[PDB]
Amino acid sequence: NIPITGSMDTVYSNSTREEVFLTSTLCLYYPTEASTQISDGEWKDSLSQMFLIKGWPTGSVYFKEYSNIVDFSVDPQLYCDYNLVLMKYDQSLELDMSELADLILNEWLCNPMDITLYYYQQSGESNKWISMGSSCTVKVCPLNTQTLGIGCQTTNVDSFETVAENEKLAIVDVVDGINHKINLTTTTCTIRNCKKLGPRENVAVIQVGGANILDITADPTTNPQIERMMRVNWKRWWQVFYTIVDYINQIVQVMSKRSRSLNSAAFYYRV
Amino acid sequence: NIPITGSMDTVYSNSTREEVFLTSTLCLYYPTEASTQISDGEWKDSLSQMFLIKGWPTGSVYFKEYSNIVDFSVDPQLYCDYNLVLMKYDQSLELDMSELADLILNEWLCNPMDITLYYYQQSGESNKWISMGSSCTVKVCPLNTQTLGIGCQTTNVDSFETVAENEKLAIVDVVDGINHKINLTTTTCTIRNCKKLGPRENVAVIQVGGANILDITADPTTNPQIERMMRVNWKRWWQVFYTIVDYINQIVQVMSKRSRSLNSAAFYYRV
Amino acid sequence: NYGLNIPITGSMDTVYSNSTREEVFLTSTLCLYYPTEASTQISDGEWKDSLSQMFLIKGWPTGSVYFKEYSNIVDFSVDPQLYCDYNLVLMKYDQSLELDMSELADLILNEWLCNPMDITLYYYQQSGESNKWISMGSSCTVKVCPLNTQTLGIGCQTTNVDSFETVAENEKLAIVDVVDGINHKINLTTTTCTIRNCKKLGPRENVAVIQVGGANILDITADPTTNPQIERMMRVNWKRWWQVFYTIVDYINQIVQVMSKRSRSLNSAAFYYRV
Amino acid sequence: QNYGLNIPITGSMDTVYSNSTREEVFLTSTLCLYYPTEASTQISDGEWKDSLSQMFLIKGWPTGSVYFKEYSNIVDFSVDPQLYCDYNLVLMKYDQSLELDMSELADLILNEWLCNPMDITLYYYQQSGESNKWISMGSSCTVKVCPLNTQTLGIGCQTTNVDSFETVAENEKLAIVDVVDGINHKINLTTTTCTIRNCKKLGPRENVAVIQVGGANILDITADPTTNPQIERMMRVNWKRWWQVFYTIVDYINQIVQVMSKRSRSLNSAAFYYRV
Ligand SMILES: *[C@@H]1O[C@H](CO)[C@@H](O[C@@H]2O[C@H](CO)[C@@H](O[C@@H]3O[C@H](CO)[C@@H](O)[C@H](O)[C@@H]3O)[C@H](O)[C@H]2NC(C)=O)[C@H](O)[C@H]1NC(C)=O
Ligand SMILES: *[C@@H]1O[C@H](CO)[C@@H](O)[C@H](O)[C@H]1NC(C)=O
Ligand SMILES: *[C@@H]1O[C@H](CO)[C@@H](O)[C@H](O)[C@H]1NC(C)=O
Ligand SMILES: *[C@@H]1O[C@H](CO)[C@@H](O)[C@H](O)[C@H]1NC(C)=O
Ligand SMILES: *[C@@H]1O[C@H](CO)[C@@H](O)[C@H](O)[C@H]1NC(C)=O
Ligand SMILES: *[C@@H]1O[C@H](CO)[C@@H](O)[C@H](O)[C@H]1NC(C)=O
Ligand SMILES: *[C@@H]1O[C@H](CO)[C@@H](O)[C@H](O)[C@H]1NC(C)=O
Ligand SMILES: *[C@@H]1O[C@H](CO)[C@@H](O)[C@H](O)[C@H]1NC(C)=O
Ligand SMILES: [Ca+2]
Ligand SMILES: [Ca+2]
Ligand SMILES: [Ca+2]
Ligand SMILES: [Ca+2]
Ligand SMILES: [Ca+2]
Ligand SMILES: [Ca+2]
Ligand SMILES: [Ca+2]
Ligand SMILES: [Ca+2]
Ligand SMILES: [Ca+2]
Ligand SMILES: [Ca+2]
Ligand SMILES: [Ca+2]
Ligand SMILES: [Ca+2]
Ligand SMILES: [Ca+2]
Ligand SMILES: [Ca+2]
Ligand SMILES: [Ca+2]
Ligand SMILES: [Ca+2]
């Protein structure tokens, strides 16, 4: 990063809202029960026409339905330029909802893990292991300096310490600085060693249900309410979508253009 | 575009080949008979590795099969950042190959036509009508200033002068200045009035078979040869792919990044 | 040691003059290479004598003109020996021979330096864009298997030749290119077909390839981007071999004016075998 | 690099060249031994190539830097002898009555010949001068020459009666035939099995050294009768055992290579004259 000098007297520039609405795309990820309750199917076209009033051209809005939160957690591709994630809260899904929110909101640099050969440590605070799949049950057996289990026997998977069971997505943090042996169902689930970089400006999460419960920061001490974790009450999905459409300017104002020299190619819905 | 002054003694910048290969995607479009002759199926991954040797990241190369030339001709969507189009020449497909090459190689600004109602002229030299679908059969009837057909009755479609039949794609040019009544088979084909902007520098077409026959310029007088219309003799598709991979530096150098502000969203494959 | 390091200073105003002499042969020699189709259609056998008699009036003394007769393009591609000084090669175009004609043209029109390749023992690479592998013989089936850095075949198992990848099958001549900098394990029928690691020096200009038939299809440069039109890549249009030979004889002064007797080699081979 | 031009080279005479030191040619070049098959038969072995390569390594030549190209016998090797190699040694075993065949083979592989083709059934030929010969190579060459006077009428021979021709060689796999320089000749030889080429002699070939293993000095390579030079590359050694001969060659290989030199035509310096 080179320095960029700037005066403190230059006049504020005009509003760039129209430029960004003409140049960018918005995409909404909502659960299937939304469409089920709406009981329609001209509704995507109607909402596109409705967005056109707020100033998003006809092709700018992309509605990507997903089955439900736990099933969408498994490797979410956010094919867009401004991402909204409607997220219906149900009791006992708190941790999984938080996991998904952390995953998409935060920028991660992930490396493959070969569970069958190497025992993996965690470098520090920012490192986690993310396991995604149809059913991930990661079991961890910590190891000594001589590679012998403590609280576990390295060859008896039954004595291992389970930290996730049958979960589509698990973000495990273990004690940093200790080698571990992992048992995860290699045919089903894929585990990656990831480091949390800064935040992802592209995505916003609209919790639809209950109290302020999302905790992106795995640290117990800090529980910061980030601006992109919006929340709203609901009884009717039509009311939720009308709320979003009416207040779309505020939402995209909260979000901001993504900035990262990525290396993994993937499909994007850009103009 | 505002003026851009420049000095004639600026030192040449360092090469950007590494940067562009690190921040772009190469985008191969090959016929299905290619893979059938290959008789393999790790070959996509193997070619990705052989591209990684040349410099591209592991996922930056995207392979897209297509059925055959006309079936690709209908709706060419180039879902990626540097497009190479392998194109096997066989006899009697000269004009459809040329039509496809022209359509992908030039930028078109274009909009629909409601054939059943209006009469349509053509603005000038750079204004064609592009018909795409399962089976296009344009049948045109020129009119007079009095709105009576010449060589054709305005009502009797049987007297209309057909200018293409049963083609998946047709880039039809008619006399520029005469109101034409069109019949086209609305079910299995759609016709859109299109105007030709500057070149689409993002694509490059590699004719695999025999001699130079592509004539993208519909004008008889001019038959220019463009750097992006490559031609390579062949007997084995493995040899074709190996030549392309080895000389990819030359190909991407010949090709340039796109420059056109689109008003439409689409699925690109970027990094 | 021809002192090929010091510059030669010319002058830009003096003069247009004559070339003195050179005493290694009484005069240059012209040298046709035609297919047997020509003889069969001509249906003669004093015709070489007649063609020599007609070159004599063009100004070529008797012993200077020689004729060579190859079976066809593929059978000439194997070890094309140019035993001679001004070589013309009449290549009758036929459909599906486009790549083979291009192979032969790229072979003879350019000056190759070839090393041996012991396929059974070692893997091989390609140093740069100018380095090809040239395989010749009665029948070549070059199956390659590229290996990663760890000497593990990618897309192929080095122990199973069936998984190897056939870049060219059953060819009399194959100028095969593979991705540069990657080791390859090669497999070809060593009894019948041999292979060589050949780098491309500059162009050879004894040879004029006269495509007798169709359109401009010769692509000597393996680069897909470039497709140059060399002056020696001639293309004439034909109905009858008498007309073809008569055109060559009539215009032979231009044919040799566009060539150079200098770039000639001791041995008649199409490459310099450097062991 | 200014190829294809004769441009003079000026050079100081009193230059120290204290940097100049011995060049280790063997670290890069490739030695290349040709021996008769009876050598192998007497040796009665089959890792002797390996043993000699190991001994060459101990002299200094890398493992892959020595080739052993067997040849059946002198006559069968004489036909189209192609020495595509970087330092050729040829162990010619001498037998009585093979004097001229050894001499002509040695001439062929010691002198660089520039060869034009010939069409015997179409043209008459005359040798330009001292440096020109006709090289006839094949399974069995039988050259019959009919000299022709100015009126194209044969002398000592009828132009049509091949039988009256004057045989200059018969049943020879190699024949460097020299005739009167300045006389047109009509040639006759068995075109299917033997080829003949009009060959000028350029300078010497320095890539090749010929160890005569047997008798006295008989190699008169110069077709002139007056001059009988002894080129240093025409080496000679007595013998009673092929193992002894091979050990001698391996022991003294450095001196042999000093006698030899890099092929002049092979270098880039000869790029546009007659490069090979
Ligand atoms: C982490 O722990 C699980 C729990 O055991 C491991 O599952 C085990 O996987 C192996 C290989 O897939 C199974 O081996 C099987 O053995 C039977 C006979 O014992 C044989 O018929 C099969 O062909 C196969 O070899 C093993 O049964 C299976 N264990 C259980 C309880 O089903 C898992 O492999 C561990 N993770 C890693 C990375 O090894
Ligand atoms: C910015 O806003 C002011 C006030 O509305 C307007 O006068 C000006 O033209 C705007 N800037 C541009 C570039 O249009
Ligand atoms: C500058 O160019 C040189 C080429 O010699 C290259 O090695 C170097 O990496 C380049 N530096 C940058 C920053 O691109
Ligand atoms: C074209 O003509 C056919 C036959 O008269 C008719 O069925 C079809 O509807 C016509 N299409 C249009 C667009 O007029
Ligand atoms: C050079 O060649 C031409 C060819 O016609 C000849 O007329 C001329 O006399 C020659 N030069 C000299 C100095 O004779
Ligand atoms: C080529 O492959 C065949 C099997 O198809 C094998 O028998 C042969 O030895 C291989 N050639 C070489 C030189 O290894
Ligand atoms: C050796 O030294 C001389 C002068 O001392 C110099 O001209 C020459 O270039 C040097 N050559 C080498 C190979 O060092
Ligand atoms: C050599 O002589 C024989 C004997 O008559 C003859 O048949 C043959 O044609 C002669 N060779 C040539 C090249 O004419
Ligand atoms: Ca335990
Ligand atoms: Ca979870
Ligand atoms: Ca941790
Ligand atoms: Ca927390
Ligand atoms: Ca078409
Ligand atoms: Ca009509
Ligand atoms: Ca027009
Ligand atoms: Ca044209
Ligand atoms: Ca394979
Ligand atoms: Ca071939
Ligand atoms: Ca190559
Ligand atoms: Ca080319
Ligand atoms: Ca003899
Ligand atoms: Ca006689
Ligand atoms: Ca003589
Ligand atoms: Ca003598």
Side-chain angles (χ1 to χ4, degrees), chain C residues 1-3 6 24 62 65-66 264-266 274, chain D residues 7-8 116-117 123 125 200 269 274-276:
Chain C
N1 191 357
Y2 279 103
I6 60 171
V24 74
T62 43
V65 171
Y66 289 118
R264 184 172 169 200
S265 305
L266 264 72
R274 194 47 43 86
Chain D
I7 197 73
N116 283 348
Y123 303 118
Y125 289 99
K200 298 290 184 71
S269 73
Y274 284 112
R275 184 179 181 169
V276 65

PDB file of all heavy atoms in Angstrom, chain C residues 1-3 6 24 62 65-66 264-266 274, chain D residues 7-8 116-117 123 125 200 269 274-276:
ATOM      1  N   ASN C   1      36.784 -20.565 -38.260  1.00  0.00           N
ATOM      2  CA  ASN C   1      37.288 -19.301 -37.743  1.00  0.00           C
ATOM      3  C   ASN C   1      37.261 -18.243 -38.835  1.00  0.00           C
ATOM      4  O   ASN C   1      38.299 -17.734 -39.240  1.00  0.00           O
ATOM      5  CB  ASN C   1      38.708 -19.474 -37.202  1.00  0.00           C
ATOM      6  CG  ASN C   1      39.182 -18.273 -36.409  1.00  0.00           C
ATOM      7  OD1 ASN C   1      38.478 -17.269 -36.298  1.00  0.00           O
ATOM      8  ND2 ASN C   1      40.379 -18.374 -35.844  1.00  0.00           N
ATOM      9  N   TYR C   2      36.062 -17.909 -39.304  1.00  0.00           N
ATOM     10  CA  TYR C   2      35.882 -16.943 -40.376  1.00  0.00           C
ATOM     11  C   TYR C   2      35.827 -15.503 -39.871  1.00  0.00           C
ATOM     12  O   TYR C   2      35.340 -14.624 -40.589  1.00  0.00           O
ATOM     13  CB  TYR C   2      34.621 -17.287 -41.174  1.00  0.00           C
ATOM     14  CG  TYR C   2      34.841 -18.387 -42.186  1.00  0.00           C
ATOM     15  CD1 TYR C   2      34.397 -19.680 -41.951  1.00  0.00           C
ATOM     16  CD2 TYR C   2      35.514 -18.135 -43.370  1.00  0.00           C
ATOM     17  CE1 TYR C   2      34.607 -20.686 -42.874  1.00  0.00           C
ATOM     18  CE2 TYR C   2      35.724 -19.131 -44.299  1.00  0.00           C
ATOM     19  CZ  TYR C   2      35.270 -20.404 -44.045  1.00  0.00           C
ATOM     20  OH  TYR C   2      35.486 -21.394 -44.974  1.00  0.00           O
ATOM     21  N   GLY C   3      36.333 -15.240 -38.669  1.00  0.00           N
ATOM     22  CA  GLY C   3      36.388 -13.885 -38.157  1.00  0.00           C
ATOM     23  C   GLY C   3      35.016 -13.265 -38.030  1.00  0.00           C
ATOM     24  O   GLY C   3      34.821 -12.091 -38.352  1.00  0.00           O
ATOM     25  N   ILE C   6      34.089  -9.201 -36.007  1.00  0.00           N
ATOM     26  CA  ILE C   6      34.414  -7.813 -36.305  1.00  0.00           C
ATOM     27  C   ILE C   6      33.349  -7.280 -37.256  1.00  0.00           C
ATOM     28  O   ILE C   6      32.869  -8.032 -38.113  1.00  0.00           O
ATOM     29  CB  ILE C   6      35.827  -7.689 -36.894  1.00  0.00           C
ATOM     30  CG1 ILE C   6      35.976  -8.490 -38.194  1.00  0.00           C
ATOM     31  CG2 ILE C   6      36.847  -8.178 -35.883  1.00  0.00           C
ATOM     32  CD1 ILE C   6      37.273  -8.223 -38.908  1.00  0.00           C
ATOM     33  N   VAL C  24      34.388 -23.665 -56.696  1.00  0.00           N
ATOM     34  CA  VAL C  24      34.215 -25.006 -56.141  1.00  0.00           C
ATOM     35  C   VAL C  24      33.414 -25.909 -57.056  1.00  0.00           C
ATOM     36  O   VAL C  24      33.535 -27.141 -56.959  1.00  0.00           O
ATOM     37  CB  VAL C  24      33.555 -24.943 -54.747  1.00  0.00           C
ATOM     38  CG1 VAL C  24      32.080 -24.609 -54.870  1.00  0.00           C
ATOM     39  CG2 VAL C  24      33.748 -26.255 -54.007  1.00  0.00           C
ATOM     40  N   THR C  62      24.216 -28.610 -69.504  1.00  0.00           N
ATOM     41  CA  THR C  62      23.532 -29.900 -69.521  1.00  0.00           C
ATOM     42  C   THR C  62      23.597 -30.595 -68.170  1.00  0.00           C
ATOM     43  O   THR C  62      22.569 -30.999 -67.619  1.00  0.00           O
ATOM     44  CB  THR C  62      24.133 -30.795 -70.598  1.00  0.00           C
ATOM     45  OG1 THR C  62      25.558 -30.691 -70.559  1.00  0.00           O
ATOM     46  CG2 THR C  62      23.629 -30.394 -71.965  1.00  0.00           C
ATOM     47  N   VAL C  65      21.062 -29.858 -64.405  1.00  0.00           N
ATOM     48  CA  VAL C  65      19.676 -30.118 -64.032  1.00  0.00           C
ATOM     49  C   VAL C  65      19.530 -31.585 -63.675  1.00  0.00           C
ATOM     50  O   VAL C  65      19.932 -32.461 -64.449  1.00  0.00           O
ATOM     51  CB  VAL C  65      18.715 -29.738 -65.166  1.00  0.00           C
ATOM     52  CG1 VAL C  65      17.319 -30.211 -64.838  1.00  0.00           C
ATOM     53  CG2 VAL C  65      18.735 -28.246 -65.392  1.00  0.00           C
ATOM     54  N   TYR C  66      18.943 -31.856 -62.514  1.00  0.00           N
ATOM     55  CA  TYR C  66      18.720 -33.217 -62.049  1.00  0.00           C
ATOM     56  C   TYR C  66      17.279 -33.374 -61.600  1.00  0.00           C
ATOM     57  O   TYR C  66      16.646 -32.418 -61.151  1.00  0.00           O
ATOM     58  CB  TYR C  66      19.665 -33.570 -60.907  1.00  0.00           C
ATOM     59  CG  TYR C  66      21.092 -33.739 -61.355  1.00  0.00           C
ATOM     60  CD1 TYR C  66      22.091 -32.909 -60.878  1.00  0.00           C
ATOM     61  CD2 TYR C  66      21.442 -34.730 -62.253  1.00  0.00           C
ATOM     62  CE1 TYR C  66      23.395 -33.062 -61.287  1.00  0.00           C
ATOM     63  CE2 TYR C  66      22.738 -34.887 -62.667  1.00  0.00           C
ATOM     64  CZ  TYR C  66      23.712 -34.053 -62.181  1.00  0.00           C
ATOM     65  OH  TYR C  66      25.010 -34.215 -62.597  1.00  0.00           O
ATOM     66  N   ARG C 264      23.959 -24.083 -48.324  1.00  0.00           N
ATOM     67  CA  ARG C 264      24.050 -25.480 -48.710  1.00  0.00           C
ATOM     68  C   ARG C 264      24.942 -26.198 -47.712  1.00  0.00           C
ATOM     69  O   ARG C 264      25.803 -25.584 -47.080  1.00  0.00           O
ATOM     70  CB  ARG C 264      24.608 -25.626 -50.126  1.00  0.00           C
ATOM     71  CG  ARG C 264      24.626 -27.046 -50.612  1.00  0.00           C
ATOM     72  CD  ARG C 264      24.997 -27.157 -52.060  1.00  0.00           C
ATOM     73  NE  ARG C 264      25.247 -28.553 -52.386  1.00  0.00           N
ATOM     74  CZ  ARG C 264      25.937 -28.981 -53.434  1.00  0.00           C
ATOM     75  NH1 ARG C 264      26.458 -28.127 -54.306  1.00  0.00           N
ATOM     76  NH2 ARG C 264      26.096 -30.280 -53.614  1.00  0.00           N
ATOM     77  N   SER C 265      24.734 -27.505 -47.575  1.00  0.00           N
ATOM     78  CA  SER C 265      25.445 -28.319 -46.601  1.00  0.00           C
ATOM     79  C   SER C 265      26.217 -29.426 -47.301  1.00  0.00           C
ATOM     80  O   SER C 265      25.871 -29.833 -48.410  1.00  0.00           O
ATOM     81  CB  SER C 265      24.473 -28.931 -45.600  1.00  0.00           C
ATOM     82  OG  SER C 265      23.696 -27.925 -44.981  1.00  0.00           O
ATOM     83  N   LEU C 266      27.276 -29.907 -46.648  1.00  0.00           N
ATOM     84  CA  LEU C 266      27.989 -31.071 -47.159  1.00  0.00           C
ATOM     85  C   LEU C 266      27.044 -32.245 -47.322  1.00  0.00           C
ATOM     86  O   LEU C 266      26.751 -32.671 -48.443  1.00  0.00           O
ATOM     87  CB  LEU C 266      29.125 -31.497 -46.226  1.00  0.00           C
ATOM     88  CG  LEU C 266      30.549 -31.032 -46.486  1.00  0.00           C
ATOM     89  CD1 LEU C 266      30.683 -29.595 -46.179  1.00  0.00           C
ATOM     90  CD2 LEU C 266      31.484 -31.851 -45.628  1.00  0.00           C
ATOM     91  N   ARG C 274      23.863 -33.861 -34.579  1.00  0.00           N
ATOM     92  CA  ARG C 274      24.949 -33.441 -33.710  1.00  0.00           C
ATOM     93  C   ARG C 274      25.238 -34.445 -32.603  1.00  0.00           C
ATOM     94  O   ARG C 274      25.958 -34.111 -31.660  1.00  0.00           O
ATOM     95  CB  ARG C 274      24.615 -32.066 -33.115  1.00  0.00           C
ATOM     96  CG  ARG C 274      25.754 -31.296 -32.428  1.00  0.00           C
ATOM     97  CD  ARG C 274      27.035 -31.276 -33.245  1.00  0.00           C
ATOM     98  NE  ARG C 274      26.761 -31.024 -34.658  1.00  0.00           N
ATOM     99  CZ  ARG C 274      26.634 -29.823 -35.210  1.00  0.00           C
ATOM    100  NH1 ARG C 274      26.747 -28.716 -34.486  1.00  0.00           N
ATOM    101  NH2 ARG C 274      26.383 -29.728 -36.508  1.00  0.00           N
TER     102      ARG C 274
ATOM    103  N   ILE D   7      36.229 -12.363 -43.901  1.00  0.00           N
ATOM    104  CA  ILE D   7      36.603 -11.074 -43.325  1.00  0.00           C
ATOM    105  C   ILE D   7      37.861 -11.292 -42.489  1.00  0.00           C
ATOM    106  O   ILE D   7      37.890 -12.222 -41.673  1.00  0.00           O
ATOM    107  CB  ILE D   7      35.433 -10.489 -42.513  1.00  0.00           C
ATOM    108  CG1 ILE D   7      35.628  -8.997 -42.260  1.00  0.00           C
ATOM    109  CG2 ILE D   7      35.252 -11.220 -41.202  1.00  0.00           C
ATOM    110  CD1 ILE D   7      35.417  -8.138 -43.488  1.00  0.00           C
ATOM    111  N   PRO D   8      38.927 -10.508 -42.660  1.00  0.00           N
ATOM    112  CA  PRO D   8      40.208 -10.895 -42.066  1.00  0.00           C
ATOM    113  C   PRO D   8      40.237 -10.660 -40.567  1.00  0.00           C
ATOM    114  O   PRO D   8      39.472  -9.868 -40.016  1.00  0.00           O
ATOM    115  CB  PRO D   8      41.223 -10.007 -42.786  1.00  0.00           C
ATOM    116  CG  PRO D   8      40.448  -8.905 -43.394  1.00  0.00           C
ATOM    117  CD  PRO D   8      38.992  -9.141 -43.201  1.00  0.00           C
ATOM    118  N   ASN D 116      27.900 -33.669 -55.406  1.00  0.00           N
ATOM    119  CA  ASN D 116      26.751 -33.445 -56.258  1.00  0.00           C
ATOM    120  C   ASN D 116      26.259 -34.770 -56.820  1.00  0.00           C
ATOM    121  O   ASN D 116      27.035 -35.717 -56.951  1.00  0.00           O
ATOM    122  CB  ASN D 116      27.105 -32.517 -57.422  1.00  0.00           C
ATOM    123  CG  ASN D 116      27.188 -31.073 -57.012  1.00  0.00           C
ATOM    124  OD1 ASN D 116      26.784 -30.700 -55.917  1.00  0.00           O
ATOM    125  ND2 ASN D 116      27.713 -30.242 -57.897  1.00  0.00           N
ATOM    126  N   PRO D 117      24.989 -34.882 -57.180  1.00  0.00           N
ATOM    127  CA  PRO D 117      24.483 -36.146 -57.705  1.00  0.00           C
ATOM    128  C   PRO D 117      24.811 -36.271 -59.184  1.00  0.00           C
ATOM    129  O   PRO D 117      25.226 -35.315 -59.836  1.00  0.00           O
ATOM    130  CB  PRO D 117      22.981 -36.032 -57.475  1.00  0.00           C
ATOM    131  CG  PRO D 117      22.708 -34.578 -57.626  1.00  0.00           C
ATOM    132  CD  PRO D 117      23.992 -33.817 -57.349  1.00  0.00           C
ATOM    133  N   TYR D 123      23.479 -37.869 -68.860  1.00  0.00           N
ATOM    134  CA  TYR D 123      24.528 -36.892 -69.116  1.00  0.00           C
ATOM    135  C   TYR D 123      25.885 -37.571 -69.209  1.00  0.00           C
ATOM    136  O   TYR D 123      26.094 -38.659 -68.669  1.00  0.00           O
ATOM    137  CB  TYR D 123      24.592 -35.840 -68.013  1.00  0.00           C
ATOM    138  CG  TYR D 123      23.308 -35.093 -67.779  1.00  0.00           C
ATOM    139  CD1 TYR D 123      22.656 -35.169 -66.565  1.00  0.00           C
ATOM    140  CD2 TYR D 123      22.759 -34.302 -68.765  1.00  0.00           C
ATOM    141  CE1 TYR D 123      21.492 -34.483 -66.344  1.00  0.00           C
ATOM    142  CE2 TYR D 123      21.595 -33.618 -68.553  1.00  0.00           C
ATOM    143  CZ  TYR D 123      20.967 -33.710 -67.340  1.00  0.00           C
ATOM    144  OH  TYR D 123      19.803 -33.025 -67.118  1.00  0.00           O
ATOM    145  N   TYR D 125      29.991 -36.897 -68.279  1.00  0.00           N
ATOM    146  CA  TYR D 125      30.665 -36.236 -67.174  1.00  0.00           C
ATOM    147  C   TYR D 125      32.159 -36.158 -67.423  1.00  0.00           C
ATOM    148  O   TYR D 125      32.758 -37.070 -67.995  1.00  0.00           O
ATOM    149  CB  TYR D 125      30.412 -36.968 -65.874  1.00  0.00           C
ATOM    150  CG  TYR D 125      29.004 -36.819 -65.388  1.00  0.00           C
ATOM    151  CD1 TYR D 125      28.068 -37.807 -65.618  1.00  0.00           C
ATOM    152  CD2 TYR D 125      28.606 -35.682 -64.710  1.00  0.00           C
ATOM    153  CE1 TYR D 125      26.779 -37.673 -65.177  1.00  0.00           C
ATOM    154  CE2 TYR D 125      27.321 -35.541 -64.264  1.00  0.00           C
ATOM    155  CZ  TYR D 125      26.412 -36.539 -64.500  1.00  0.00           C
ATOM    156  OH  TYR D 125      25.124 -36.399 -64.060  1.00  0.00           O
ATOM    157  N   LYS D 200      33.839 -33.137 -54.980  1.00  0.00           N
ATOM    158  CA  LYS D 200      35.026 -32.316 -54.806  1.00  0.00           C
ATOM    159  C   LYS D 200      35.598 -32.555 -53.420  1.00  0.00           C
ATOM    160  O   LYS D 200      34.854 -32.821 -52.473  1.00  0.00           O
ATOM    161  CB  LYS D 200      34.706 -30.831 -54.958  1.00  0.00           C
ATOM    162  CG  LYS D 200      34.190 -30.421 -56.303  1.00  0.00           C
ATOM    163  CD  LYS D 200      35.268 -30.491 -57.347  1.00  0.00           C
ATOM    164  CE  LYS D 200      34.764 -29.981 -58.677  1.00  0.00           C
ATOM    165  NZ  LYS D 200      34.561 -28.510 -58.682  1.00  0.00           N
ATOM    166  N   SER D 269      30.913 -20.763 -37.195  1.00  0.00           N
ATOM    167  CA  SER D 269      31.751 -19.926 -38.044  1.00  0.00           C
ATOM    168  C   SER D 269      31.630 -20.313 -39.508  1.00  0.00           C
ATOM    169  O   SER D 269      31.767 -19.456 -40.388  1.00  0.00           O
ATOM    170  CB  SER D 269      33.204 -20.024 -37.590  1.00  0.00           C
ATOM    171  OG  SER D 269      33.755 -21.278 -37.943  1.00  0.00           O
ATOM    172  N   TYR D 274      29.576 -24.191 -46.107  1.00  0.00           N
ATOM    173  CA  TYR D 274      29.081 -25.535 -46.364  1.00  0.00           C
ATOM    174  C   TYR D 274      28.792 -26.253 -45.048  1.00  0.00           C
ATOM    175  O   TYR D 274      29.199 -27.394 -44.847  1.00  0.00           O
ATOM    176  CB  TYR D 274      30.063 -26.313 -47.241  1.00  0.00           C
ATOM    177  CG  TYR D 274      30.023 -25.909 -48.691  1.00  0.00           C
ATOM    178  CD1 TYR D 274      31.087 -25.255 -49.282  1.00  0.00           C
ATOM    179  CD2 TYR D 274      28.902 -26.154 -49.460  1.00  0.00           C
ATOM    180  CE1 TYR D 274      31.038 -24.873 -50.603  1.00  0.00           C
ATOM    181  CE2 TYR D 274      28.844 -25.775 -50.774  1.00  0.00           C
ATOM    182  CZ  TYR D 274      29.909 -25.136 -51.342  1.00  0.00           C
ATOM    183  OH  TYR D 274      29.838 -24.764 -52.661  1.00  0.00           O
ATOM    184  N   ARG D 275      28.113 -25.576 -44.116  1.00  0.00           N
ATOM    185  CA  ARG D 275      27.919 -26.112 -42.768  1.00  0.00           C
ATOM    186  C   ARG D 275      27.398 -27.543 -42.802  1.00  0.00           C
ATOM    187  O   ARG D 275      26.675 -27.935 -43.720  1.00  0.00           O
ATOM    188  CB  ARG D 275      26.941 -25.243 -41.977  1.00  0.00           C
ATOM    189  CG  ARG D 275      26.763 -25.688 -40.531  1.00  0.00           C
ATOM    190  CD  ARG D 275      25.820 -24.798 -39.767  1.00  0.00           C
ATOM    191  NE  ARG D 275      25.699 -25.235 -38.383  1.00  0.00           N
ATOM    192  CZ  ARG D 275      25.119 -24.531 -37.419  1.00  0.00           C
ATOM    193  NH1 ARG D 275      24.595 -23.338 -37.669  1.00  0.00           N
ATOM    194  NH2 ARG D 275      25.063 -25.026 -36.193  1.00  0.00           N
ATOM    195  N   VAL D 276      27.794 -28.325 -41.805  1.00  0.00           N
ATOM    196  CA  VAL D 276      27.415 -29.729 -41.730  1.00  0.00           C
ATOM    197  C   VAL D 276      27.118 -30.114 -40.289  1.00  0.00           C
ATOM    198  O   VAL D 276      27.563 -29.464 -39.346  1.00  0.00           O
ATOM    199  CB  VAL D 276      28.513 -30.624 -42.302  1.00  0.00           C
ATOM    200  CG1 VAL D 276      29.768 -30.542 -41.457  1.00  0.00           C
ATOM    201  CG2 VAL D 276      28.028 -32.052 -42.414  1.00  0.00           C
TER     202      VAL D 276
END
